[PDB]
Write a structure and sequence with these properties.
The structure is cut from a larger assembly and holds six copies of chain A. Chain A has 48 residues and is mainly alpha-helical. Chain A contains two helices and no strands. Chain A has helices at 10-16, 19-47. The N and C termini of chain A lie far apart (27 Å). Chains in contact: A-C, A-D, A-E, B-C, C-D, C-E, C-F, E-F. Chains B and C meet through loops of B and strand 3 and strand 14 of C. Strand 1 (9-10) of chain E pairs antiparallel with strand 1 (17-18) of chain F. Bound molecules: a molecule of 2 linked components (NAG-NAG) and 2-acetamido-2-deoxy-beta-D-glucopyranose (7 copies). Residues 216-218 of chain B line the site of one 2-acetamido-2-deoxy-beta-D-glucopyranose. It is classed as viral protein. Keywords: SARS-CoV-2, Spike glycoprotein, viral protein. The entry is titled "Structural basis for neutralization of SARS-CoV-2 and SARS-CoV by a potent therapeutic antibody". Chains A, B, C, D, E, F: Spike glycoprotein. The organism of A, B, C, D, E, F is Severe acute respiratory syndrome coronavirus 2.
Chain lengths: 48, 226, 328, 48, 49, 28
Amino acid sequence: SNFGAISSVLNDILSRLDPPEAEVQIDRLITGRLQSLQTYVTQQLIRA
Amino acid sequence: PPAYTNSFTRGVYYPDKVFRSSVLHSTQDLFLPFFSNVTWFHAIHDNPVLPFNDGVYFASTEKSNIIRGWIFGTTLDSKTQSLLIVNNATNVVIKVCEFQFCNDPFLGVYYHKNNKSWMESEFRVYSSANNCTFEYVSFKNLREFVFKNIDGYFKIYSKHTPINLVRDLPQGFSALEPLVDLPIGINITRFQTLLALHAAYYVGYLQPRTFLLKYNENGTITDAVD
Amino acid sequence: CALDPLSETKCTLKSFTVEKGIYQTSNFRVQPTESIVRFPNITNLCPFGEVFNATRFASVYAWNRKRISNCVADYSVLYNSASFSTFKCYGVSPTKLNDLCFTNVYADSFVIRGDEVRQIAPGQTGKIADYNYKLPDDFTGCVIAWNSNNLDSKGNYNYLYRLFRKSNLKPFERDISTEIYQAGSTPCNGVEGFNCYFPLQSYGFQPTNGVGYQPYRVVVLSFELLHAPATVCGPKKSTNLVKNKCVNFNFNGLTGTGVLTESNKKFLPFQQFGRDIADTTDAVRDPQTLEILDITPCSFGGVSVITPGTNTSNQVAVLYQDVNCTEV
Amino acid sequence: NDLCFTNVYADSFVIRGDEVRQIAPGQTGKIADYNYKLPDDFTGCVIA
Amino acid sequence: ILPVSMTKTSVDCTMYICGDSTECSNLLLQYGSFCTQLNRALTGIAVEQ
Amino acid sequence: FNKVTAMQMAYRFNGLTVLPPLLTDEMI
Ligand SMILES: *[C@@H]1O[C@H](CO)[C@@H](O[C@@H]2O[C@H](CO)[C@@H](O)[C@H](O)[C@H]2NC(C)=O)[C@H](O)[C@H]1NC(C)=O
Ligand SMILES: *[C@@H]1O[C@H](CO)[C@@H](O)[C@H](O)[C@H]1NC(C)=O
Ligand SMILES: *[C@@H]1O[C@H](CO)[C@@H](O)[C@H](O)[C@H]1NC(C)=O
Ligand SMILES: *[C@@H]1O[C@H](CO)[C@@H](O)[C@H](O)[C@H]1NC(C)=O
Ligand SMILES: *[C@@H]1O[C@H](CO)[C@@H](O)[C@H](O)[C@H]1NC(C)=O
Ligand SMILES: *[C@@H]1O[C@H](CO)[C@@H](O)[C@H](O)[C@H]1NC(C)=O
Ligand SMILES: *[C@@H]1O[C@H](CO)[C@@H](O)[C@H](O)[C@H]1NC(C)=O
Ligand SMILES: *[C@@H]1O[C@H](CO)[C@@H](O)[C@H](O)[C@H]1NC(C)=O
């Protein structure tokens, strides 16, 4: 999932952009993925 | 009166150039809706101008290779650009020039002389061309083409596939890989095919449908779901 | 935190006391041995002479579009020149321009008035952006401009732009038609008149005009970057290839860390990169000699640090998960 | 005005007109690549 | 028939988020203890499993 | 055990691993 980032491959953005701009893009991937775990864990805790 | 027919599942093309396998890949692009009416045309003993819409799905069941190319443009009165795709002698010619058409363009064929069909340089589609902003040069059969303008590009997809059926579209599935991407950058609202005069061919109209594509292990689309 | 499997836990717990138990540290990861850079081999230099030094740039209403292919980006050679009054790259960060090979590269060259270089950018509007030239909203490329006022100026009326058009263009659309524009109801019948305007109005350029009217030469590149077979490459040499060992790779600008292996996957001629369920690139095609490499990431398998309380004893016993005991 | 500073270094030099653009984190060109360079985390002002 | 235990899972949050990438892995430290409080949740499961 | 029943190769590569249960299917 892109999560609003320009591309979903973490290694593309870093090759395609500077560190200053990648911060804006990557932190959209992290905040998205890191949230997609907190969804998974929350599913387990309930299911467990 | 042009007859209709049923498009079946035809009209799926590789959306992008990235190889995949064993994966169901949802994608949204301009596709031919499944089971949509596709207009059906004749060559017997008939090449109207057609609305180009968003993109056109062209499927020509042929034997003697009658249909040699297409003509694109908004007006076709020589007051605007026009795209001319012509295939003769296996050679492809693409010109965006602005040129004044004959009202029923065709390319010539003379039956059984030392040069079959002759008429290779016959070049009666048009009076003459002035400003040319682009150039390129190079029923047992079924050839399918997808034509679309994406943000000024002009994209063409194709499959050259053998079949045995006389009457109708083959019921089945084939995925169209990309051929070229001529950057003509012109407004195309209408088009007219070309014919070789001494061969039915189909026209669908794409829509922004969303398909789910199934890539098999060799990286080919073996099925689809609209 | 990197000292040894024990101290890897204390950083996790944020504690110097580690209670008796089992703790699973991050999967053990192998640092990349060496760097690989693999680009297609071609010695040619892109026509930076025939794009940037060209003697006549076409007018903006009909702008030339020149496909650039099979060359190495000479980008370091532009530095002795009139340079650039604006260089603005929408898709790429300009630092990466060297590290990264391109795909469909079209230089679109035309001469516009000074004030209007602003108007070339995705989203802008005005006389240039609306009528005679337009850029996509997703545009990926660079927009380069430098004043030609020492050349294009004499009054030079040849450079010319489309003032009137019924509606706005689509991206990268060209309309060179001169047919008269009808302001009111009455047909113009192909002649100027009241509420009839010849749509193309020529710029004047004197050599003495203010910076607003000094003609700038704009050249707008375009490219797809990844996803596509590379043609135009960067000024970066290619190294030797390493198989079956953890490496740090650059293939056609795609970078990462992987273990490059051979593969039987068969790409259609137009396909370059393969991708996975996770869309991380699984397989690439070696650009110099065409063959399909599987990229398998390093760092597989979990670690678990079995320890009695560091309060008691400082010895630990590590549990590597699903490896027969050889590799580590 | 509201805010006092800490390590303040004025770095003064004369560059060609077109190239004031090139002084900014992330830019590249003859000035930014070769003879002067600014950090990606740079904190300060650029006056010309 | 009754279920008793469910498959014990454990996630590496540093590796799932930023795959094997240095420039990204540094950034995940700003978000901090998110990573480290998941594995405290998925461990509490796997213990009572 | 006959009724109840790559996939795990693309799970450990990302991080989603599966720990083994403490008690074997034999001890149970
Ligand atoms: C592409 O050409 C078509 C015509 O071939 C344009 O559609 C016309 O739009 C005008 C309004 O600007 C209408 O008055 C006409 O009736 C339309 N003609 C048809 C046949 O629909 C269309 O606007 C052009 N596209 C662009 C971007 O200019
Ligand atoms: C197809 O054409 C028939 C007429 O032959 C019409 O009844 C039907 O509604 C059309 N359907 C579509 C999807 O165009
Ligand atoms: C096709 O038409 C072109 C017109 O440009 C002509 O030059 C050529 O000889 C013809 N025949 C073939 C086989 O290309
Ligand atoms: C892939 O192609 C091979 C022929 O090289 C064929 O044997 C195999 O069945 C194909 N796989 C699929 C899923 O069609
Ligand atoms: C443009 O021409 C000048 C001399 O007229 C030359 O020095 C320069 O190298 C040329 N530009 C490029 C990019 O080669
Ligand atoms: C690159 O050069 C080598 C020899 O120097 C050659 O074997 C190889 O074919 C070239 N690359 C490609 C893609 O052909
Ligand atoms: C842990 O260390 C404390 C000393 O601070 C000691 O009193 C206690 O007995 C120790 N416990 C174990 C289990 O070693
Ligand atoms: C270790 O490898 C041998 C053969 O190489 C195999 O029989 C054995 O099952 C492996 N260990 C485990 C725990 O499976």
